[PDB]
Design a protein around this ligand. Structure first.
Ligand SMILES: O=c1ccn([C@H]2C[C@H](O)[C@@H](COP(=O)(O)NP(=O)(O)OP(=O)(O)O)O2)c(=O)[nH]1
Ligand SMILES: [Mg+2]
Length: 254
């Protein structure tokens, strides 16, 4: 099934750790400073085109007090990929070399056919959209250092062999607001938001605050192994990415 993920990579602050087991991992070569309750952004000098019928997912994993956004990359994006990190601590902290792994992998997804929004669920913009955006059904405030859940009870459209999952949007993650990715199961979901910044953040009713992605079910496993990662989704299912090889395509860098 998974043909080739075509990718370019140039960054002398980062190292390619391996393009095996269907997932590309980079690792930091130098210390990265993380200012407290501020957004730290790592430009990767990484570019990538997912093979047909697949999307790319981008994420950091670390053993330090730092949370990273999980990014769903539009299958048509051709720009430099960024990792967006958020700082737990209230003082300067650092990620030493290799304390930060950065992962890029693909997954099969489907797009429901919808002419209209179904409640908070915004219909797709064209047949292949990776994620449908989902709107806040009520004005929200988040005090600094607060988590808030929003409940969605609308039943998502249904697609055989696919598993509706919620991820955050990078715009909000740029603002210090992160969504905990998780399964949107049959009777509704509670989406977790955390204000990592130092200011109250007001979010307006109807604002798009996360996105719905239909992962194929082969990407959900109950097994920890080298082909899975428990850091992406909520306890219960781990994300297992497609098996793809990477094919280096220098000319994609821009
Ligand atoms: O961690 C990430 C996430 C996204 N991206 C890029 C690729 C993706 O296609 C694009 C959009 O990401 P999101 O959709 O999560 N952000 P938002 O929905 O707020 O903005 P856009 O208007 O670009 O969809 O930005 C990154 O480089 N890193
Ligand atoms: Mg988006």
């Amino acid at each position: 099934a998974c043909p080739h993920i075509r990718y370019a990579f140039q960054n002398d602050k980062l190292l390619l750790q391996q393009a095996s087991v269907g997932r590309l991992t980079l690792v930091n070569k130098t210390t990265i400073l993380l200012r407290p309750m501020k957004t730290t952004t790592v430009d990767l000098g990484l570019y990538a085109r997912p093979p047909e019928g697949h999307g790319l997912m981008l994420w950091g994993s670390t053993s330090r007090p730092v949370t990273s956004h999980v990014g769903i990359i539009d299958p048509g994006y051709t720009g430099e990929l960024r990792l967006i990190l958020q700082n737990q601590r209230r003082y300067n902290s650092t990620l030493r070399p290799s304390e930060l792994k950065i992962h890029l992998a693909a997954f099969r997804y489907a797009t429901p056919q919808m002419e209209e929004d179904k409640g908070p669920i915004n219909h797709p913009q064209y047949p292949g959209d990776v994620g449908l955006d989902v709107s806040l059904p009520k004005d929200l405030a988040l005090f600094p250092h607060q988590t808030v859940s929003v409940t969605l009870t609308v039943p998502p459209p249904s697609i055989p062999h696919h598993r509706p999952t919620i991820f955050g949007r990078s715009g909000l993650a740029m603002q210090g607001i992160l969504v905990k990715p998780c399964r949107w199961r049959r009777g509704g979901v509670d989406v977790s938001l955390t204000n990592f910044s130092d200011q109250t953040v007001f979010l307006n009713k109807y604002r798009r605050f996360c996105q719905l992605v239909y992962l194929h079910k082969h990407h959900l496993t109950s097994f920890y192994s080298p082909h899975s990662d428990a850091g992406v989704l909520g306890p219960r299912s781990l994300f297992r990415w497609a098996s793809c090889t990477f094919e280096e395509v220098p000319s994609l860098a821009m």
